[PDB]
Design a protein around this ligand. Structure first.
Ligand SMILES: *[C@@H]1O[C@H](CO)[C@@H](O[C@@H]2O[C@H](CO)[C@@H](O[C@H]3O[C@H](CO)[C@@H](O)[C@H](O)[C@@H]3O)[C@H](O)[C@H]2NC(C)=O)[C@H](O)[C@H]1NC(C)=O
Ligand SMILES: *[C@@H]1O[C@H](CO)[C@@H](O[C@@H]2O[C@H](CO)[C@@H](O[C@H]3O[C@H](CO)[C@@H](O)[C@H](O)[C@@H]3O)[C@H](O)[C@H]2NC(C)=O)[C@H](O)[C@H]1NC(C)=O
Ligand SMILES: *[C@@H]1O[C@H](CO)[C@@H](O[C@@H]2O[C@H](CO)[C@@H](O[C@H]3O[C@H](CO)[C@@H](O)[C@H](O)[C@@H]3O)[C@H](O)[C@H]2NC(C)=O)[C@H](O)[C@H]1NC(C)=O
Ligand SMILES: *[C@@H]1O[C@H](CO[C@@H]2O[C@@H](C)[C@@H](O)[C@@H](O)[C@@H]2O)[C@@H](O[C@@H]2O[C@H](CO)[C@@H](O)[C@H](O)[C@H]2NC(C)=O)[C@H](O)[C@H]1NC(C)=O
Ligand SMILES: *[C@@H]1O[C@H](CO)[C@@H](O[C@@H]2O[C@H](CO)[C@@H](O)[C@H](O)[C@H]2NC(C)=O)[C@H](O)[C@H]1NC(C)=O
Ligand SMILES: *[C@@H]1O[C@H](CO)[C@@H](O[C@@H]2O[C@H](CO)[C@@H](O)[C@H](O)[C@H]2NC(C)=O)[C@H](O)[C@H]1NC(C)=O
Ligand SMILES: *[C@@H]1O[C@H](CO)[C@@H](O[C@@H]2O[C@H](CO)[C@@H](O)[C@H](O)[C@H]2NC(C)=O)[C@H](O)[C@H]1NC(C)=O
Ligand SMILES: *[C@@H]1O[C@H](CO)[C@@H](O)[C@H](O)[C@H]1NC(C)=O
Ligand SMILES: *[C@@H]1O[C@H](CO)[C@@H](O)[C@H](O)[C@H]1NC(C)=O
Ligand SMILES: *[C@@H]1O[C@H](CO)[C@@H](O)[C@H](O)[C@H]1NC(C)=O
Ligand SMILES: *[C@@H]1O[C@H](CO)[C@@H](O)[C@H](O)[C@H]1NC(C)=O
Lengths: 316, 40, 240, 46
């Protein structure tokens, strides 16, 4: 749904504790401001993306104090109030199964929405989902009993609604056991989170690569700036310095171009995730292979670090 | 008498859905809504 | 419906007539094309290390063999400027196409058709939409049914009438708390629970939360009318 | 005749098969006819 936000001081990356390096950087004009702008145009897009994926309701719906959902035991995915975090149990796995510089002018400022706020939006999306059916996605949240919501779902997949009621104990049991297979699978392997652990590793390795380039000679006799300004004269050290300005500026331009290209793929991912939120959570999609595999009944959104995770519920 | 205020962001209007195992809220009137959407 | 629709077309017209900044999504395209062109012009002032940035002032101060050292400079930094711009523009071109593919998809599924996708054609149940030109953009006026006055009712998933379990064909069973009715899934318009509004399957032991009420048959008064007609003609035919 | 519906003759639909189709009017018209029939037999006695 997002990458990390980032800002770099182009001056503290290229230079640092050297005024004559800045007096050389200014000889290249506006590039540094354009770079900072460019990363700001990514960073703004990260909070926009997160807000379009999760903020699809203008009301928080609290889940009701009594859990009479006809036998569907949502307690694995509803928030637990008894804990310090207001995350669900399943999403408190997701928050751990993904795992995770200021000296060089790089700054990794926080998102707009906090994780405890995203947890509240995914709570309201789920709580509306089990108490209201889909109606809150179009108008007001209108209550209906969950076994009648599922009857409507069944009608949606073209299966006549007696088929729910004649089998309700079985259908809830199958469902409840299936929410168990999710829980245990997420407890078993990292290989499920790989789409997120990838985009976290890749944005980390991008910053770590931009930092190591500070040590590159680029054909100057040393990358340590104080060597160049101490050991050599003002007019030939200027020639050794323009090598470092030029190599480091190309390095930052490589990072900024790479981040824009990435942020274009994260956007596409966020616009998909926002579309799956609207059409799979706030509704029942008729589209084959869109809300998972089978015929679609409903889905439940969860938070994950920089991402959204859908439990798609389907009839097979 | 104006000044800048800084606050934790309200997620929305907080609400509780009046759920029971036998209760339903069939709507009885409607408003046709026209909403603008803008794309480049 | 028409008065509400006309009032809503009114509201959109008055909104965009009153406010300053709803088209921000289009102005930030025209702003970025202007601001990037201007930045590409600003770079014409950059020395990039050269004694001067004005190309002709180099040629009017240095000779053919030594001026080439300054000019290579200016060629380096201006070429870096253009590759910066053309990369930045190619990236935008990918965003604007992704926006235009969404706009074609909305034209196709919201103007040329009715969509069942939730909020793909604006936040409500989609009725239809009208496209409008805007500079470098499209604007969709989406027209939507939105539920308003809610009322609560008691309900049950099925009805028992003779040990057999009944279900709505279309819609749902409702009660005001005295009498039981069936009504359509999106708008309260109750009906008497007839065997033509409903279908039957299985028996009252299995359906959790089933409730008891009479299920009416429109053949019953017809047949009853035949009875009274017949019983009269048999009472009559005692006489001769 | 409440789960199905009727159109055209059986010569146009390639691969059609034969079976009886039940009509729920009929046994009610019949159970009326036997009752009405009794009304006629009893009414022969006066
Ligand atoms: C729940 O909804 C019911 C349907 O609107 C309503 O019952 C109806 O009430 C009216 C009076 O308001 C009755 O009117 C008839 O009453 C007798 C019938 O023999 C006649 O003397 C009268 O002239 C008149 O024809 C309706 O017959 C009655 N409908 C039914 C199906 O019985 C309830 O009163 C409503 N209850 C609540 C709490 O709103
Ligand atoms: C819905 O309507 C049903 C018919 O009025 C009613 O079913 C009846 O329930 C009672 C109590 O469980 C049973 O009572 C009899 O039980 C055994 C024989 O089955 C006898 O030993 C008892 O003395 C007593 O006579 C009825 O047999 C049963 N009848 C039918 C047709 O099912 C439901 O209880 C009603 N439910 C509600 C909530 O209204
Ligand atoms: C399905 O049921 C059909 C209705 O009973 C039945 O159609 C009947 O088939 C026979 C044999 O083809 C026809 O018999 C006539 O055929 C010619 C005249 O066309 C004469 O040589 C015969 O002596 C005889 O008159 C019936 O006329 C025909 N019924 C109708 C209304 O035309 C099908 O054969 C059944 N098919 C199966 C697979 O069960
Ligand atoms: C529909 O009813 C619910 C609550 O059930 C009602 O409870 C009584 C007040 C009485 O009216 C009963 O006949 C009903 O069965 C309503 O929810 C309440 O709404 C008020 C504000 O109006 C709120 O302060 C309460 O906390 C709510 N109570 C509960 C338990 O949720 C609901 O508003 C009604 N909806 C409509 C559209 O009429
Ligand atoms: C919903 O199912 C969960 C298990 O998936 C139930 O939680 C267990 O409940 C028992 C009895 O209280 C405890 O001994 C277990 O340690 C609980 N396990 C967990 C993981 O919490 C829960 O009680 C069920 N709730 C309902 C309403 O049926
Ligand atoms: C439908 O399939 C389910 C399982 O997917 C069947 O339920 C099982 O039934 C056997 C006994 O026949 C039990 O041993 C299992 O414990 C049941 N599992 C569950 C989840 O309830 C069910 O019998 C099948 N129904 C039909 C009509 O074929
Ligand atoms: C449905 O809602 C509309 C308004 O959205 C109601 O129309 C108004 O009716 C009152 C009188 O009851 C008038 O004072 C208003 O001027 C009407 N507005 C319009 C646009 O005509 C309508 O009464 C409601 N219908 C029902 C069945 O509740
Ligand atoms: C509905 O819930 C109440 C408790 O609030 C319970 O007594 C009743 O038996 C339940 N009925 C059904 C059909 O679930
Ligand atoms: C008996 O029925 C006939 C019609 O079948 C009618 O002409 C006649 O007046 C009736 N007489 C009485 C006494 O009902
Ligand atoms: C089905 O195939 C068989 C040959 O295997 C053929 O005899 C028969 O006519 C076919 N039926 C239809 C309806 O085409
Ligand atoms: C026979 O007809 C008489 C009226 O003439 C009626 O009272 C009686 O109930 C009828 N009995 C039967 C068995 O139909």
């Amino acid at each position: 749904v997002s990458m990390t936000k980032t800002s770099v001081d182009c001056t503290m990356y290229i230079c640092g504790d050297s005024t004559e390096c800045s007096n050389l950087l200014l000889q290249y004009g506006s590039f540094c401001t354009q770079l900072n702008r460019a990363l700001t145009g990514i960073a703004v897009e990260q909070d926009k993306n997160t807000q379009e994926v999760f903020a699809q309701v203008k009301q928080i719906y609290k889940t009701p104090p009594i859990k009479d959902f006809g036998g569907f035991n949502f307690s694995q995915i509803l928030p637990d109030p008894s804990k310090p975090s207001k995350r669900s149990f399943i999403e408190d796995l997701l928050f751990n199964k993904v795992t995770l510089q200021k000296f060089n002018g790089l700054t990794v400022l926080p998102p707009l929405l906090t994780d405890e706020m995203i947890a509240q939006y995914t709570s309201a999306l789920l709580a509306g989902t089990i108490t209201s059916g889909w109606t809150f996605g179009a108008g007001a949240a209108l209550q209906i009993p969950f076994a009648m919501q599922m009857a409507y779902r069944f009608n949606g997949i073209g299966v006549t609604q007696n088929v729910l009621y004649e089998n309700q104990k079985l259908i809830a049991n199958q469902f409840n056991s299936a929410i168990g297979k999710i829980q245990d699978s997420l407890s078993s392997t990292a290989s499920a989170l790989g789409k997120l652990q990838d985009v976290v590793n890749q944005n980390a390795q991008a910053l770590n690569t931009l930092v190591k380039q500070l040590s590159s000679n680029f054909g100057a006799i040393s990358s340590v700036l104080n060597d160049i300004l101490s050991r050599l004269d003002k007019v030939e050290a200027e020639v050794q310095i323009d090598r470092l300005i030029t190599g480091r500026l190309q390095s930052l331009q490589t990072y900024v171009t790479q981040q824009l290209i990435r942020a274009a793929e994260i956007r596409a991912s966020a616009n998909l995730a926002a579309t799956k939120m609207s059409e799979c959570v706030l509704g029942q999609s008729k589209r084959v292979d869109f809300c998972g595999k089978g015929y679609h009944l409903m889905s439940f959104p969860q938070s994950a670090p920089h991402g959204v995770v859908f439990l798609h519920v389907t009839y097979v | 008498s104006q000044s800048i205020i800084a606050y934790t962001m309200s997620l929305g209007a907080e609400n509780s859905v009046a759920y029971s195992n036998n209760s339903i809220a069939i709507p009885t009137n409607f408003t046709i809504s026209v909403t603008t959407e803008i794309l480049p | 419906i028409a008065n509400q629709f006309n009032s809503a077309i009114g509201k959109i017209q008055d909104s965009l007539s009153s406010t300053a900044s709803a088209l921000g999504k289009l102005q930030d395209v025209v702003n970025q094309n202007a601001q990037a062109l201007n930045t590409l012009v600003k770079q014409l002032s950059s020395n990039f290390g050269a004694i001067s940035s004005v190309l002709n002032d180099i040629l009017s101060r240095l000779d053919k063999v030594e001026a080439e050292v300054q000019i290579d400079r200016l060629i380096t930094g201006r070429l870096q400027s253009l590759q910066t711009y053309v990369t930045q523009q190619l990236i935008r071109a990918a965003e604007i196409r992704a926006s235009a593919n969404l706009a074609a998809t909305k034209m196709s599924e919201c103007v040329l058709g009715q969509s069942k996708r939730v909020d793909f054609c604006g936040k409500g149940y989609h009725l239809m939409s009208f496209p409008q030109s805007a500079p470098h953009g499209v604007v969709f006026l989406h027209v939507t049914y939105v539920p308003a006055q809610e009322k609560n009712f008691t309900t049950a998933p099925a009805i028992c009438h003779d040990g057999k379990a009944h279900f709505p064909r279309e819609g749902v069973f409702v009660s005001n708390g005295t009498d039981w009715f069936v009504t359509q899934r999106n708008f309260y318009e109750p009906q008497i629970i007839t065997t033509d509004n409903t279908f039957v399957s299985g028996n009252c032991d299995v359906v959790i939360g089933i409730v008891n009420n009479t299920v009416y048959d429109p053949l019953q008064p017809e047949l009853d009318s035949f009875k009274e007609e017949l019983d009269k003609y048999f009472k009559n035919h005692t006489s001769p």
